[PDB]
Design a binder for this molecule. Structure first.
Ligand SMILES: Nc1nc2c(nc(N3CCOCC3)n2[C@@H]2O[C@H](COP(=O)(O)OP(=O)(O)OP(=O)(O)O)[C@@H](O)[C@H]2O)c(=O)[nH]1
Ligand SMILES: [Mg+2]
Length: 323
């Protein structure tokens, strides 16, 4: 199965860099940016500029329209990277110019090529201010038109669920860690020899035209680990306003330490089926978590919601038209 992960803009690129550092295997990684200095700092193996003419290699100045133009100008570069691909993850931090503006053009180009197109988009922290969030939400409306599924993660939910950080740098490292777990949990059950592999065909049937997608993760240790992990995952969505229990399709990854036998999945999946929608179609895989002991992590990607709505702080977000 040919899977690619494409980071778009600075934040998106940083998440893909973390995936590389975390040892993602069996996938080809790319970083796309209009800011050439930032590209030069990355360890991601494939580094691609867009927008030389409109930005001169100096970034998009927080203007999504310039990110969009950069992608359109260089749509040939994008098509070349997307050749011979089954699935692509498009990782973007929404709220700047390049991720916000270019991600929809890359997504549309992939989807028109028949590639299973999964956006992995963050919404900004509250400390980034109100204008970055407005721009993020406007861009998300274009990204959704262009994607099979769009996983939306609100950085404030990561902060709520994580240790206090003392630098903005460290706040973003926690975001990158979560995004990396989220993506590696899907890829590793398809393209690496796993505890329980899933067929790519099943990942496609789960995510194709799924639309808004929400993730929740939970860890469990010791004797009650299945119940603890499942309860935490289902009650810890990384986007508010649409409970994981209403989704009609779900993709579940069970990470297991080496000492936990595979049949832990029997109990996990019974508990998940009891908690979520009775008619949900759920596909699941299992993969090893190195360096852990007496441990599982349950990660749930929930999609195919009845309504493509969510909440950010005190704002209920709906889009104009759902295709
Ligand atoms: N995963 C992840 N996300 C990050 C990271 N850093 C940021 N920002 C980017 C903005 O400055 C503060 C930190 N972001 C987020 O990226 C969002 C977009 O910023 P950007 O990716 O730097 O912007 P761009 O797509 O490069 O657009 P430009 O061409 O610079 O206008 C921000 O709102 C942040 O929430 C990071 O290291 N990892
Ligand atoms: Mg930038």
């Amino acid at each position: 199965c040919k899977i690619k992960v494409i980071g778009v803009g600075g934040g998106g690129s940083n998440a893909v860099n973390r995936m590389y550092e975390d040892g993602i295997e069996g996938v080809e990684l790319y970083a796309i940016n209009t800011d050439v200095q930032h590209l030069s700092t990355l360890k991601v193996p494939n580094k691609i500029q867009i927008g030389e003419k409109v930005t001169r290699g100096l970034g998009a100045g927080a203007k999504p329209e310039v990110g969009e133009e950069a992608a359109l100008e260089d749509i040939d570069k994008i098509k070349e990277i997307l050749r011979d691909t089954d699935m692509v993850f498009i990782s973007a931090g929404l709220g700047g110019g390049t991720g916000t503006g270019a991600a929809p053009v890359i997504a549309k180009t992939a989807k028109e090529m028949g590639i299973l197109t999964v956006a992995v988009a963050t919404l900004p922290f509250r400390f980034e201010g109100p204008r970055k969030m407005e721009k993020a939400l406007k861009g998300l409306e274009k990204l959704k038109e262009s994607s099979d599924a769009y996983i939306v993660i609100h950085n404030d939910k990561i902060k709520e669920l994580s240790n206090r950080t003392l630098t903005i740098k460290d706040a973003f490292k926690e975001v990158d860690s979560v995004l990396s777990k989220a993506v590696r949990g899907i890829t590793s059950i398809v393209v690496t020899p796993a505890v329980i592999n899933v067929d790519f065909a099943d990942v496609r049937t789960t995510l194709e035209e799924g639309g808004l997608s929400i993730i929740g993760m939970g860890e469990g240790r010791g004797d009650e680990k299945a119940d603890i992990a499942v309860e935490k995952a289902v009650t810890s969505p990384l986007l508010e306003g649409n409970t994981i229990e209403g989704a009609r399709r779900l993709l579940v990854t069970i990470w297991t330490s080496e000492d936990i036998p595979y049949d832990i999945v029997d109990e996990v999946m019974e508990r998940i089926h009891s908690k979520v929608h009775p008619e949900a179609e759920i596909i699941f895989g299992a993969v090893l978590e190195p360096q852990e002991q007496d441990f599982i992590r349950v990660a749930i990607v929930a999609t195919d919601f009845p309504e493509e709505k969510f909440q950010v702080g005190e704002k209920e977000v709906k889009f104009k038209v759902i295709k």
